[PDB]
Amino acid sequence: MKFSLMTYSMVSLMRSGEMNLEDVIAFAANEGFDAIELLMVNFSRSSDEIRRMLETHQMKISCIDAFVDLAAQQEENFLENISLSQRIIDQAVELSAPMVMLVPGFPDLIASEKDKQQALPRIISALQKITPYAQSKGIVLTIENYSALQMPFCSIAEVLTILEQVPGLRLTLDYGNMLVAGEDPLEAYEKLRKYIVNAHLKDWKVTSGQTGTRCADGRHLEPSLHGQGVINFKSLFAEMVSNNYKGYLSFEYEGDINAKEAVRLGMMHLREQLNEVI
Amino acid sequence: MKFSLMTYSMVSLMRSGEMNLEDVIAFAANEGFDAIELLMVNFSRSSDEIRRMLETHQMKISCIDAFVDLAAQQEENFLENISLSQRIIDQAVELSAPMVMLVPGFPDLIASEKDKQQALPRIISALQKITPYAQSKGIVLTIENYSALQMPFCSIAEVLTILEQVPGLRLTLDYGNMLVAGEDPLEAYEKLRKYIVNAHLKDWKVTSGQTGTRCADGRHLEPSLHGQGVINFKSLFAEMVSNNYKGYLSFEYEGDINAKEAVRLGMMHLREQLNEVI
Numbered sequence A, B: 001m002k003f004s005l006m007t008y009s010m011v012s013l014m015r016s017g018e019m020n021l022e023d024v025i026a027f028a029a030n031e032g033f034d035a036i037e038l039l040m041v042n043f044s045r046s047s048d049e050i051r052r053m054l055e056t057h058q059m060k061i062s063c064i065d066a067f068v069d070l071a072a073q074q075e076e077n078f079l080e081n082i083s084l085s086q087r088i089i090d091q092a093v094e095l096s097a098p099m100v101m102l103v104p105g106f107p108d109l110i111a112s113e114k115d116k117q118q119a120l121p122r123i124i125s126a127l128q129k130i131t132p133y134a135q136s137k138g139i140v141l142t143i144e145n146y147s148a149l150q151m152p153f154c155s156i157a158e159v160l161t162i163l164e165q166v167p168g169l170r171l172t173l174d175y176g177n178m179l180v181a182g183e184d185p186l187e188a189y190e191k192l193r194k195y196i197v198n199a200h201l202k203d204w205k206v207t208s209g210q211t212g213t214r215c216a217d218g219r220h221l222e223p224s225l226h227g228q229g230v231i232n233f234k235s236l237f238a239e240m241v242s243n244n245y246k247g248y249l250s251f252e253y254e255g256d257i258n259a260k261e262a263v264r265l266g267m268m269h270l271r272e273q274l275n276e277v278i
């Protein structure tokens, strides 16, 4: 039951220039994380440089995350996105990360029911091409269940449909995203357990006005510090220990509290809950 | 002073299957719009049937909108995104749309201040290749000022810096997005007037909790029906009339009110304000 810190959780401070990637790695080390989950949106940093930072701070990468448009209808773009996915797998090899997580589409690019219906077999086809490459390189490929419901990979049923058609594909369960999709997060873990090799932990609190995140049941949702919202982390941890889960628990925070403070506060809660289970 | 309906404003009902594209075109005609502004996320609709729908309902396309990653760091992907942009221009020719609007990056793909700095010259170089192609096809190419501030095309200064480096490039001014960026919308119009060939009209109201849109000055923002928020549309209309603006005013709504109701309500307000000017 090791914890990893998503670099995406620190994106506010990376965007302001207050933290660079090495600062995020050093902060993860200082806060007792076993790994980082590295969001990769370009290859501008050399592998040598990242490896140096990891060695300096005695840190590992548990998983590399990327957004890739595997729903692309244009053949040349679709093919280049499969190629980009293979480049990401190569980066995992170079950086000793055991796993990749792809978000295989973009919500603004699905603008109708027909678009969603067409995106699904396209995404499946792409993953059927990418996963064998990942396997040949010794890398575990996952997708994440998402929060924008026009994407055909949010509900338990949607993610199961993909996983059952892509040999060897695994799942990063974003526990909080399941709430947005109208699912019970614990039931999602139970139904998808055999596929779950990685997990994202984030929390939500209910609001009165629009947020750009409304779950299927109508409740307005705002990112919450972990333990201050509605997600029951202890029940998940109890089931995971019961089932001898061996993956990482990745800290995700998408809110507006200072990112370092949010990590310190939320990890206090998550560690307390895990200790109650252990 | 003509009005166009963004098909994006109807995206909720297209995603739910309640409206198809022809329904949006017929709705626009029934509500007295001169045109639609068509969001194009794929080429799956046949040009012949779109043209048929437009003739049936006596409607036009004022502008085609698309999202393309012109900041892509990987050369193969970047070149294919230039090619995709040229294909979008070809669709504008096939559909008799006189104008294209590109959103030239994706906010989740800019994860640091360094990424923003590197993205800007990349986007400019792409637009320097795409704009002569548009010119060769008689199409006016625009970008839109955006709302996620990690993208180097949100402030007045950022948009002006791009426009002044790309001969013939023009601007779709999203009046509400300027408010997100901490600018005065009317001042944005005044400073960018010579480039503005299309405009998006949307409104915002002020809220207390997290929304995924925080204005640069700290106010949390919620999509508003036009006239119920803080954007002064009459001042803009007065200046556009004084300057004899010849483009379209495009109706944008990103909120959760039923999309047909939102069009009817917001257009009542906007037409009243325009009538007060004339």
Ligand SMILES: [Mn+2]
Pocket (backbone or CB within 6 Å): A144, A174, A200, A252
């Ligand atoms: Mn996640």
Ligand SMILES: [Mn+2]
Pocket (backbone or CB within 6 Å): B144, B174, B200, B252
């Ligand atoms: Mn707009």
